[PDB]
Design a protein around this ligand. Structure first.
Ligand SMILES: *[C@@H]1O[C@H](CO)[C@@H](O)[C@H](O)[C@H]1NC(C)=O
Ligand SMILES: [Ca+2]
Ligand SMILES: [Ca+2]
Length: 434
């Protein structure tokens, strides 16, 4: 796709801190850009929509190439249309925003400049951020994660894409999303199937895969940390059911691991650690700090800070594993106790180290789940399972919670606030901000 200028594109500013081993942190100035899928896609020479509702224009978009040549992406009014606002080192995302149309959530990327994404090399470093999930009920997911996207949004690899990072192009993740309207400089009109439960989305014949580090997926009820390796580290297009993931038929037939080696304190047995109220170690009605460390061995560590008190990731006992570190032993025991082989089949933490050794883009979003109602995060899943089944219970939400249409109309004011992002070598982010 190309870019049009009927509506100006002004990326809301966002500062963050970069720390060093010497004990100092310095303020960095960046900005955020919304994903291309949320943008107005129309004819380059007119205001005629190339995509409307959940269907493409059969005249403007008869095939993937013609569509990309005839269509462009336009600017976004962050606050008024998407409910996205920033203030200093803070970023807030509103769940539902009503303007000329109804918007639900957003997916944003941190930029290094007006035309490029900020890349982070996680291995040997730690990432810290503050979050307020008090306004996120069952069925919602305020996420902060990393994906192996290109810094230019794919422009150098695919000439027909001239919008680039400035317009939020180039997305990819471990589920090889087929709901993307534009992939590899082309439209995803071929093989398009409108959603039977979502009037604004569909599934195309191609997907976009890449490694994904889900540092934070959570609401006021549950939270999970999950690395997802792929046989191909960076962005790569996939075709049809060969994509695997949520959008396809065979979930494990692709090059990426859609499940991951997840760590959910509640799912592992500690049901009093994270929840809303003073009866929980971490009170989700109040802001908290989340620190994630990527050691060179490939293992991941995590600690939290609330009201000045530090809490390491709670201890878990699973099979022959015991500890609070996400490592090979944990992931192996999880597959043995909870079932599955996807993570290990994709190389495990060793293959994942290849992703963290390279650059990854920071993503921040808020979404509801049209495929599984977020039950996999905060409820019993599958819903037919019981509590006696190892790993079935992941949260206290009812198995009837998370219906998109219901949460969107009942909790439109829901929102998430991410702030005070700090990045640097392990042991450095707790030092004085500059
Ligand atoms: C849950 O984790 C917290 C913090 O590590 C700990 O104090 C508490 O004893 C744990 N509770 C259970 C039931 O494991
Ligand atoms: Ca994902
Ligand atoms: Ca270690």
């Amino acid at each position: 796709q190309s870019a049009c200028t009927l509506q100006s594109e002004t990326h809301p500013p966002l500062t963050w801190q970069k720390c060093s081993s010497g004990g100092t942190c310095t303020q960095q100035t960046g900005s955020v850009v919304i994903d291309a899928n949320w943008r107005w896609t129309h004819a380059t020479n007119s205001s005629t929509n190339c995509y409307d509702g959940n269907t493409w224009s059969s005249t403007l978009c008869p095939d993937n190439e013609t569509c990309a040549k005839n269509c462009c992406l336009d600017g976004a009014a962050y606050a008024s249309t998407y409910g996205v606002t920033t203030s200093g080192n803070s970023l807030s995302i509103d769940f539902v925003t009503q303007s000329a149309q109804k918007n639900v959530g957003a997916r944003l990327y941190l930029m290094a400049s007006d035309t490029t994404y900020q890349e982070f090399t996680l291995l040997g470093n730690e990432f810290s951020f503050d979050v307020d999930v008090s306004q996120l009920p069952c069925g919602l997911n305020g996420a902060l994660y990393f994906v192996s996207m290109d810094a230019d949004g794919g422009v150098s690899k695919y000439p027909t894409n001239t919008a680039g990072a400035k317009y939020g192009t180039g997305y990819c993740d471990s589920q090889c999303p087929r709901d993307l309207k534009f992939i590899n400089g082309q439209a995803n009109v071929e093989g398009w199937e409108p959603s039977s439960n979502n009037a604004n989305t569909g599934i195309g014949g191609h997907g976009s895969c890449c490694s994904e580090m889900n540092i934070w997926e959570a609401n006021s009820i549950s939270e999970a940390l999950t690395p997802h390796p792929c046989t191909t580290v960076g962005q790569e297009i996939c075709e049809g059911d060969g994509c695997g993931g949520t959008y396809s038929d065979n979930r494990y037939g692709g090059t990426c691991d859609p499940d991951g080696c997840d760590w959910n304190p509640y799912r592992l047995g500690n049901t009093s650690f994270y929840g809303p109220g003073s009866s929980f170690t971490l009170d989700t009605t109040k802001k908290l700090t989340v620190v994630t460390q990527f050691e060179t061995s490939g293992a991941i560590n995590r600690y939290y800070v609330q009201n000045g008190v530090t809490f390491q990731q709670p201890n878990a006992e699973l099979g022959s594993y015991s500890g609070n570190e996400l490592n090979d032993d944990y992931c192996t025991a999880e597959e043995a106790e909870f079932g599955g082989s996807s993570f290990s089949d994709k190389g495990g933490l060793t293959q994942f180290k290849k992703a963290t050794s390279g650059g990854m883009v920071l993503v921040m979003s808020l979404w509801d789940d049209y495929y599984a109602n977020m039950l996999w995060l905060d409820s019993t899943y599958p819903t037919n399972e019981t509590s006696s089944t190892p790993g079935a219970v992941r949260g206290s939400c009812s198995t009837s919670s998370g219906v998109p249409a219901q949460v969107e109309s009942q909790s439109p004011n829901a929102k998430v606030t991410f702030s005070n992002i700090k990045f640097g070598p392990i042991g450095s982010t707790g030092n004085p901000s500059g």
